[PDB]
Motif scaffolding. Structure first.
Motif, PDB file in Angstrom:
ATOM      1  N   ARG A  86       8.293   1.295  -6.189  1.00  0.00           N
ATOM      2  CA  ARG A  86       8.279   0.818  -5.109  1.00  0.00           C
ATOM      3  C   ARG A  86       9.620   1.176  -5.429  1.00  0.00           C
ATOM      4  O   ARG A  86       9.907   0.997  -3.983  1.00  0.00           O
ATOM      5  CB  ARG A  86       7.166  -0.657  -6.289  1.00  0.00           C
ATOM      6  CG  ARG A  86       5.959  -0.985  -6.127  1.00  0.00           C
ATOM      7  CD  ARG A  86       5.954  -2.160  -7.042  1.00  0.00           C
ATOM      8  NE  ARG A  86       4.395  -2.588  -5.818  1.00  0.00           N
ATOM      9  CZ  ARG A  86       3.260  -3.261  -6.769  1.00  0.00           C
ATOM     10  NH1 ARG A  86       3.599  -3.536  -8.199  1.00  0.00           N
ATOM     11  NH2 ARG A  86       2.633  -2.963  -6.262  1.00  0.00           N
ATOM     12  N   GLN A  87      10.441   0.965  -5.824  1.00  0.00           N
ATOM     13  CA  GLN A  87      11.624   1.558  -6.357  1.00  0.00           C
ATOM     14  C   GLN A  87      12.121   2.486  -4.874  1.00  0.00           C
ATOM     15  O   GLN A  87      13.075   2.347  -3.913  1.00  0.00           O
ATOM     16  CB  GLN A  87      12.521   1.672  -7.194  1.00  0.00           C
ATOM     17  CG  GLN A  87      14.460   2.026  -7.195  1.00  0.00           C
ATOM     18  CD  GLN A  87      14.929   0.880  -6.168  1.00  0.00           C
ATOM     19  OE1 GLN A  87      15.629   0.642  -5.384  1.00  0.00           O
ATOM     20  NE2 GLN A  87      14.681  -0.401  -7.182  1.00  0.00           N
TER      21      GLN A  87
ATOM     22  N   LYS B 189       9.987   3.716  -2.567  1.00  0.00           N
ATOM     23  CA  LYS B 189       9.301   3.098  -1.068  1.00  0.00           C
ATOM     24  C   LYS B 189      10.359   2.359  -0.777  1.00  0.00           C
ATOM     25  O   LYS B 189      10.886   2.493   0.698  1.00  0.00           O
ATOM     26  CB  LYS B 189       7.885   2.119  -1.574  1.00  0.00           C
ATOM     27  CG  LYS B 189       6.825   3.054  -1.906  1.00  0.00           C
ATOM     28  CD  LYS B 189       5.052   2.071  -1.248  1.00  0.00           C
ATOM     29  CE  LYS B 189       5.876   1.327  -2.416  1.00  0.00           C
ATOM     30  NZ  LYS B 189       5.785   2.322  -4.028  1.00  0.00           N
ATOM     31  N   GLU B 190      11.308   0.846  -2.126  1.00  0.00           N
ATOM     32  CA  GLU B 190      12.354   0.541  -1.023  1.00  0.00           C
ATOM     33  C   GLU B 190      13.713   1.130  -0.571  1.00  0.00           C
ATOM     34  O   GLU B 190      13.507   0.756   0.788  1.00  0.00           O
ATOM     35  CB  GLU B 190      13.203  -0.616  -2.049  1.00  0.00           C
ATOM     36  CG  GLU B 190      12.159  -1.413  -2.894  1.00  0.00           C
ATOM     37  CD  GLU B 190      12.834  -2.407  -4.017  1.00  0.00           C
ATOM     38  OE1 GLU B 190      13.770  -1.383  -4.057  1.00  0.00           O
ATOM     39  OE2 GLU B 190      11.538  -3.383  -4.515  1.00  0.00           O
ATOM     40  N   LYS B 191      13.805   2.001  -0.832  1.00  0.00           N
ATOM     41  CA  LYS B 191      14.630   2.931  -0.780  1.00  0.00           C
ATOM     42  C   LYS B 191      14.293   3.662   0.906  1.00  0.00           C
ATOM     43  O   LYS B 191      15.103   4.102   1.585  1.00  0.00           O
ATOM     44  CB  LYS B 191      15.214   4.056  -1.782  1.00  0.00           C
ATOM     45  CG  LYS B 191      15.795   2.762  -3.210  1.00  0.00           C
ATOM     46  CD  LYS B 191      16.258   4.318  -3.820  1.00  0.00           C
ATOM     47  CE  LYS B 191      14.953   4.785  -4.256  1.00  0.00           C
ATOM     48  NZ  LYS B 191      15.526   5.665  -5.833  1.00  0.00           N
TER      49      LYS B 191
ATOM     50  N   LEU C 186      11.883   2.985   2.867  1.00  0.00           N
ATOM     51  CA  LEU C 186      11.731   2.341   4.331  1.00  0.00           C
ATOM     52  C   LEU C 186      13.060   1.630   3.873  1.00  0.00           C
ATOM     53  O   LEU C 186      13.268   1.260   5.789  1.00  0.00           O
ATOM     54  CB  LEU C 186      10.582   1.639   4.007  1.00  0.00           C
ATOM     55  CG  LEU C 186      10.326   0.175   2.832  1.00  0.00           C
ATOM     56  CD1 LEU C 186      10.546  -0.613   3.784  1.00  0.00           C
ATOM     57  CD2 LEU C 186       9.349   0.215   2.704  1.00  0.00           C
ATOM     58  N   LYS C 187      14.076   1.698   3.959  1.00  0.00           N
ATOM     59  CA  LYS C 187      15.527   1.186   3.783  1.00  0.00           C
ATOM     60  C   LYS C 187      15.908   2.328   4.711  1.00  0.00           C
ATOM     61  O   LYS C 187      16.677   1.466   5.320  1.00  0.00           O
ATOM     62  CB  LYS C 187      15.740   0.552   2.873  1.00  0.00           C
ATOM     63  CG  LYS C 187      17.198   0.174   2.838  1.00  0.00           C
ATOM     64  CD  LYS C 187      17.815  -0.405   3.962  1.00  0.00           C
ATOM     65  CE  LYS C 187      16.707  -2.264   3.581  1.00  0.00           C
ATOM     66  NZ  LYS C 187      17.294  -3.296   4.432  1.00  0.00           N
TER      67      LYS C 187
ATOM     68  N   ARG D   6      16.877   3.594  11.732  1.00  0.00           N
ATOM     69  CA  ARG D   6      16.679   3.145  13.173  1.00  0.00           C
ATOM     70  C   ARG D   6      17.526   2.081  13.982  1.00  0.00           C
ATOM     71  O   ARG D   6      17.091   2.483  14.915  1.00  0.00           O
ATOM     72  CB  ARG D   6      15.138   2.333  12.831  1.00  0.00           C
ATOM     73  CG  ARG D   6      13.939   1.308  14.309  1.00  0.00           C
ATOM     74  CD  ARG D   6      12.653   0.960  13.365  1.00  0.00           C
ATOM     75  NE  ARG D   6      12.078   0.612  14.846  1.00  0.00           N
ATOM     76  CZ  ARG D   6      11.808  -0.984  15.855  1.00  0.00           C
ATOM     77  NH1 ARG D   6      12.922  -1.382  15.426  1.00  0.00           N
ATOM     78  NH2 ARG D   6      12.088  -1.128  16.578  1.00  0.00           N
TER      79      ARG D   6
ATOM     80  N   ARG E 143      10.499  -6.861   3.215  1.00  0.00           N
ATOM     81  CA  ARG E 143      10.571  -5.939   5.377  1.00  0.00           C
ATOM     82  C   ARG E 143       9.121  -4.830   5.098  1.00  0.00           C
ATOM     83  O   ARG E 143       9.214  -4.378   6.189  1.00  0.00           O
ATOM     84  CB  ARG E 143      11.631  -5.774   4.663  1.00  0.00           C
ATOM     85  CG  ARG E 143      12.107  -4.614   3.480  1.00  0.00           C
ATOM     86  CD  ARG E 143      13.135  -5.055   2.564  1.00  0.00           C
ATOM     87  NE  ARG E 143      13.462  -3.924   1.875  1.00  0.00           N
ATOM     88  CZ  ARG E 143      13.861  -2.986   1.710  1.00  0.00           C
ATOM     89  NH1 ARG E 143      14.275  -2.258   2.808  1.00  0.00           N
ATOM     90  NH2 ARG E 143      14.253  -2.180   0.899  1.00  0.00           N
ATOM     91  N   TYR E 144       8.682  -4.238   3.830  1.00  0.00           N
ATOM     92  CA  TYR E 144       8.339  -3.723   3.488  1.00  0.00           C
ATOM     93  C   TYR E 144       6.789  -3.693   4.550  1.00  0.00           C
ATOM     94  O   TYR E 144       7.063  -2.317   5.243  1.00  0.00           O
ATOM     95  CB  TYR E 144       6.676  -3.782   2.622  1.00  0.00           C
ATOM     96  CG  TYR E 144       7.792  -2.723   1.370  1.00  0.00           C
ATOM     97  CD1 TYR E 144       9.078  -2.584   0.877  1.00  0.00           C
ATOM     98  CD2 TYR E 144       6.775  -1.844   1.108  1.00  0.00           C
ATOM     99  CE1 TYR E 144       9.714  -2.227   0.284  1.00  0.00           C
ATOM    100  CE2 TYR E 144       7.565  -0.930  -0.395  1.00  0.00           C
ATOM    101  CZ  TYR E 144       8.874  -1.141  -1.185  1.00  0.00           C
ATOM    102  OH  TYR E 144       9.681  -0.680  -2.312  1.00  0.00           O
TER     103      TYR E 144
ATOM    104  N   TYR F 141       7.935  -4.648  14.386  1.00  0.00           N
ATOM    105  CA  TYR F 141       8.584  -3.898  15.064  1.00  0.00           C
ATOM    106  C   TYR F 141       7.656  -2.521  15.901  1.00  0.00           C
ATOM    107  O   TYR F 141       7.784  -3.158  17.643  1.00  0.00           O
ATOM    108  CB  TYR F 141       9.333  -2.342  14.717  1.00  0.00           C
ATOM    109  CG  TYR F 141      10.478  -2.694  13.864  1.00  0.00           C
ATOM    110  CD1 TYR F 141      11.481  -4.250  14.553  1.00  0.00           C
ATOM    111  CD2 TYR F 141      11.156  -2.516  13.026  1.00  0.00           C
ATOM    112  CE1 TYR F 141      12.052  -5.102  13.640  1.00  0.00           C
ATOM    113  CE2 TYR F 141      12.335  -2.752  11.884  1.00  0.00           C
ATOM    114  CZ  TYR F 141      12.902  -3.803  12.935  1.00  0.00           C
ATOM    115  OH  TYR F 141      13.676  -4.146  12.102  1.00  0.00           O
TER     116      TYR F 141
END
Lengths: 48, 146
Positions: free
Chosen positions: A18-19, A21-23, A25-26, A32, B7-8, B15
């Motif tokens: 999960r971390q 994925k956090e990093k 997609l952050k 973006r 946010r995921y 968007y």
RNA sequence: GAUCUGCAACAAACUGAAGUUAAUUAUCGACGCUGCUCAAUGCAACGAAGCAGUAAUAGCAAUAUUACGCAAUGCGCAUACCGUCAUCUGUGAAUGCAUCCCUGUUCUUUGCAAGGGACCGCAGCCGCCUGAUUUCAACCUCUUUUUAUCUCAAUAUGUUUAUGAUGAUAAUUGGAAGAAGAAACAGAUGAAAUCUGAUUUAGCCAUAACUAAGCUAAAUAGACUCGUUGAUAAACAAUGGG
RNA sequence: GCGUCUUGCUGUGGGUGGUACAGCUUCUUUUUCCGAAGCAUGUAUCGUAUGUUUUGACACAGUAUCGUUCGUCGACUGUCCAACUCGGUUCAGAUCUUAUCGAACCGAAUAAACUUUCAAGUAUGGGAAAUGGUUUUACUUUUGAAGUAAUGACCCUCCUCUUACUGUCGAUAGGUAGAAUCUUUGAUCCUACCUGCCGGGUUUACGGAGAUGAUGUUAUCAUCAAAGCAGAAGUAGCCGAC
RNA sequence: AGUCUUAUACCUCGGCCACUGGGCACGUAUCGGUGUUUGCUAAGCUUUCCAACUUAGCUCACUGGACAUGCACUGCUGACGUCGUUGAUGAUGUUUGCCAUCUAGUGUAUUAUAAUCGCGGCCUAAAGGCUGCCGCUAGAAAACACAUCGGUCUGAUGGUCCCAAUUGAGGGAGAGUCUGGGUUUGACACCUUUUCUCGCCACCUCAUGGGUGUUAUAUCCAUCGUUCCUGGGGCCCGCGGC
């Protein structure tokens, strides 16, 4: 990532993924918005 | 922390929703036009006894016509066309508001295909900038400007 | 209706009675007046005796006390608040860009352009104080000749020794604000600092029974920062040997 | 330019009120025999309301989560539209393909293109909108708690443009505030307001203890103001519904 | 010769080999620690002399770790009504939830059939072309086995519609010619290979000059730019060795 998240069963690996994925997609959303704003100035410069 | 894990899914879904809204709106607002110009002449009879070098008065109006349509479908580019609901007020706690907004957006964007038609209009315009000169034939000194 | 598989309803009765009647047991209102209740408990306001907490004492009684009960009060105790500081988190104004709302009224020699308000999002000035500190001179002063530190050098003596100072710093004589802090004066934390029984030992008691249940004192051990202060033990970065 | 008390910063320093408890000593008592006196030091306390045996402990019965929009009655309606359909449910039944037809129901759907009309009914703005009051500044500088202002603003006040928002009755429904009558100390009547319920800062206003200055009167006139109500606020949970 | 077991063969030879989802066991590169002797490595006591013993360990066994193998095998995931309780949950039927693919190439057959030509649809109606599904081959451990700090920074110019000089270059296509290969015999003929020539070949790209269009277009093209790879001669920097 949800392919592994679907069947993990170990809380440590679950939270670490999960971390991840956090990093990831952050970074994705940061690049973006940076791309969007830089192409905004790019179009402004092209028009000028 | 659990709520900030939002946010995921909210960020990219919103968007892409804005992406599809833009890619439909840009094509939907085409505002097509079509026009043409001609330089047809206008003739006004001149009495012959007036002894003028030119027998017929000639005018050259800039003739302009234009016809255009809109062709908008039956849909809801209105209230649904709003900025990100969270904006900068993410401090307000909610879980049902976002799902309600998403399902409302989805049903709106799905329900457009039923109707597609609009109106049109056409114009007929003339511009005159004719400064004509005529000579009293056999008397070049005498002259008339129109 | 499978139709030689049976089911459902019609609630008059039927053993089993869900309520009341018929009978038995127990209780209370047993006084009900303006009035007796959702069937019972229940009275702003109605009537009499005695005193208006109960019991006893000397006493009809008041009177004084006691035992119980009731009521009130007191930072005595605590609770919420603020009063109180401390530490920490936290140090500010004007400038633009981007979004939304409203608008032909002198809109218009191309039928489609031009104006006003809003706050968010994005970029633009510099100081300040606090946390706590580096700037400057030791450049007349020989018996009333400040000290300490970072420090040097010539000469005499074939020792184991003797002498001369510039620059800066401190014991804060003075100021900037910096080592940490973009939208200012508000929030967060604290109002604690011990306990074991659960270890051993010693002592008392014969114990429900066995004499020693149980209890008391010393020490070990264990749980234990409430935020602030500092270092320390370990992993993290540490190129090796002949 | 010089000397001076006081005053405001206590600017600096010093001493001082302490109470209770803890503990020590002394006398009596069997050295604190269940009492008394003095004493070093330490801690706590020197605020409001609450609870003071509603302080604590043992038993019985009961105690799911989340997120929603709503909630004194009835009337045309201040107020919901494609109303005559859509989708589904169930079924007396029929044709018997698994299929088709018919009926009832459910959720969506009737108000009017809102109400309102003393024209900000309730809020917004502007006025070459004046008076008066208040708040700054300037001047005279002397006025009777001195005066004057072509003063920067606010308030008051009159007129005025858009936009937003909203009917009433029977309830003697419930409550609230005022007033009066009777009196039970509560009741009655009338007026005005509110009702999903009962809950926080701020903003405006009201009356208003006490206090302050002046004046000729414990009397008056001016100023402040305790606590409390009311317009938006802004936030719980209370049952019911999902 | 008979019985049991292991190994090969034997159908599988983990659900696939594209994934041991996990468990089990022995086997093992084996590695540390013990029980450790017949004998032994070096040393040593009691010092003329080691010519008579022991010590740290060594065989082997056990223990712990690691690797591999097959599978008699097994799982991974827990919620509904719950049941008396236990504190957390012990049981009951239940259902849902897995590692399980994508990519590239290939594809019959029969034949005179509109008869197809793995299966099926589209266009043109010919000696057809396009596409969906399936079959056969290779890559993708992607997938189950398998990856683990944050923040910041990281290319330009012109063209792409038409026309003119073919003006020039480059590349494609065709026609032949030649050298050789394949069917045929002795060939020819056809297919294919190489050299060369050719050009009204409106073929493509670039170079030049213009105009058209707003609805020319590249998800590109061409040039340069940074970085990386290969061969490095060498010096600016420049040492070591010969």
């Amino acid at each position: 990532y949800d392919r592994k998240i679907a069947s993990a069963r170990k809380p440590a690996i679950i939270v670490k993924l999960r971390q991840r994925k956090e990093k990831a997609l952050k970074a994705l959303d940061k690049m973006r918005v940076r791309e969007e704003k830089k192409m905004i100035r790019e179009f402004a410069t092209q028009a000028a | 922390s659990l709520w900030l894990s939002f946010r995921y899914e909210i960020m990219p879904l919103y968007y892409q929703s804005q992406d599809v809204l833009d890619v439909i709106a840009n094509s939907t607002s085409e505002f097509m036009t079509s026009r043409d110009f001609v330089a047809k002449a206008i003739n006004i009879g001149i009495p012959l006894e007036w002894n003028l070098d030119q027998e017929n008065l000639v005018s050259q109006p800039r003739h302009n016509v234009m016809v255009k349509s809109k062709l908008s479908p039956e849909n809801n580019i209105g209230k649904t066309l709003s900025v990100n609901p969270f904006t900068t007020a993410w401090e307000l706690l909610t879980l049902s508001f976002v799902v309600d907004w998403f399902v409302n957006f989805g049903d709106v964007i799905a329900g457009f295909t039923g109707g597609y038609s609009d109106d049109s209009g056409a114009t007929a315009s003339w511009r005159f900038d004719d400064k004509k000169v005529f000579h009293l034939k056999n008397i070049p000194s005498a002259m008339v400007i129109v």
